[PDB]
């Protein structure tokens, strides 16, 4: 029958910023998970509930794939149990997470000489994200007790700090593209197999 459009998710030309991570629903298809592993062009490949071998031998009700961009300093946080700028205020994975986390260095595609100022994370937030919650607010945050009147100024900062992607950057401050595969099981029949 059908193939899973995992090639559309990974090899897509546009990725989103972390705060507005793009999630896509993969269903009614069959994809090769051994073949994803047999890349060896991914710098990070960690799976959390599942074996990357036993994935071709499985079926799930829904497969979810979230795609964003972070820096390398931050890649260690796309994991259960992680606390951080990203792990708290941008994109958080629960502690029962079964899935894979895949990320590679996209400095050739995702940075510019003048500054690629188009990817952003949420530096400032009142509380931590719930797992898999999305915050798209652009309210002007408040750090000190003086209010903000919706404009930026000292101790009233804009919540979204642009990554300053230049290629000359060091490894940690280079863009890493990321895709998280979560695998759901519910009473509904299986739709993504091997």
């Amino acid at each position: 029958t059908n193939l899973c459009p995992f090639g559309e998710v990974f090899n897509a030309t546009r990725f989103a910023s972390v705060y507005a991570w793009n999630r896509k629903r993969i269903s009614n298809c069959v994809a090769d998970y051994s073949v994803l592993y047999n890349s060896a062009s991914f710098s990070t490949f960690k799976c959390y509930g599942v074996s990357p071998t036993k994935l071709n031998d499985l079926c799930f009700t829904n497969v979810y794939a979230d795609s964003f961009v972070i820096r390398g300093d931050e890649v260690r946080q796309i994991a259960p149990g992680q606390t951080g700028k990203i792990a708290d205020y941008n994109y958080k994975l629960p502690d029962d997470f079964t899935g894979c986390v895949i990320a590679w260095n996209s400095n050739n595609l995702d940075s510019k000489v003048g500054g690629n100022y188009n990817y952003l994370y949420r530096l400032f937030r009142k509380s931590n994200l719930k797992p898999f919650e999305r915050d798209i607010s652009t309210e002007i945050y408040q750090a000190g007790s003086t209010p903000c009147n919706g404009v930026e100024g000292f101790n009233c900062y804009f919540p979204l700090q642009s990554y300053g992607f230049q290629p000359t950057n060091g490894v940690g401050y280079q863009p890493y593209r990321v895709v998280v595969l979560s695998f759901e099981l519910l009473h509904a029949p299986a739709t993504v197999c091997g």
Epitope: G115, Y117, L120, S145, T146, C148, N149, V151, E152, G153, F154, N155, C156, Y157, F158, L160, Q161, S162, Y163, G164
Partner: antibody, heavy 119, light 108 residues
């Protein structure tokens, strides 16, 4: 030695354009907001525009909105102002200035440049 | 668009006199203010910031005070080399607004 060296400036045939450049040394420039403030001959300080520490955010005065384009490069620590459709009134000395880090509310200014818009 | 109202426009004093300048903000700005001293045609220089705290290298005679609406700059013993125009700057909300500016004369 915190210092903002400004450069460019000078006599612009009205209607033309000029670029203004601000070479930053002495601090972690990528931490600080930045601003372009001009001062007509023997008149007040007019703030004109700013750019967030990340370049995420940007606003312009109504006196220059749409007309001027502010920018920052954060590897070369400079801050740039592209001034288009210059007027008689736009004649001023132009100053760049660090406004504040997330943590040190400590301004500092550059030496200025005489943008002199006439024919 | 916080307006700054600074007095006097022009003060004249003799050496060793105590010049006192007031800047009042059109809304609460709770210590987000700096004080500069601008000799003619020269860059403004920082003297006080955070309403009260004295920049390194600024003679101790200069001093700031205030929080909210009323702010003062004080030269406890004026000097022949303080002839300038003195501005306050509001940092609470952009656009950054400045005070009128106070010229200072030395009487001899």
């Amino acid at each position: 030695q915190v210092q903002l060296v400004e450069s460019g400036g000078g006599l612009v045939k009205p209607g033309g354009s000029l670029r203004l450049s601000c070479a930053a040394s002495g601090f972690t420039f990528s931490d600080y907001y930045m601003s372009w403030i001009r001062q007509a001959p023997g008149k007040g300080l007019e703030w004109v525009s700013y750019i967030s520490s990340s370049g995420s955010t940007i606003y312009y005065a109504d006196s220059v909105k749409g007309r001027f384009t502010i920018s920052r490069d954060n590897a070369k620590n400079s801050l740039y102002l592209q001034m288009n459709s210059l007027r008689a009134e736009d004649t001023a000395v132009y100053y760049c200035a660090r406004d504040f880090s997330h943590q040190q509310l400590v301004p500092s200014w550059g030496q200025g440049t005489l943008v002199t818009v006439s024919s | 668009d916080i307006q700054l109202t600074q007095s006097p426009s022009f003060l004249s004093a003799s050496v060793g006199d105590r010049v006192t300048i007031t800047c009042r903000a059109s809304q609460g700005i709770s210590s987000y203010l700096a004080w500069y001293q601008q000799k003619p045609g020269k860059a403004p220089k920082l003297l006080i910031y955070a309403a009260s705290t004295l920049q390194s290298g600024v003679p101790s005679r200069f001093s700031g005070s205030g929080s909210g609406t009323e702010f003062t700059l004080t030269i406890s013993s004026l000097q022949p080399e303080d002839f300038a125009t003195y501005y306050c700057q509001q940092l609470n909300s952009y656009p950054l607004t400045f005070g009128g500016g106070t010229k200072v004369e030395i009487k001899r």
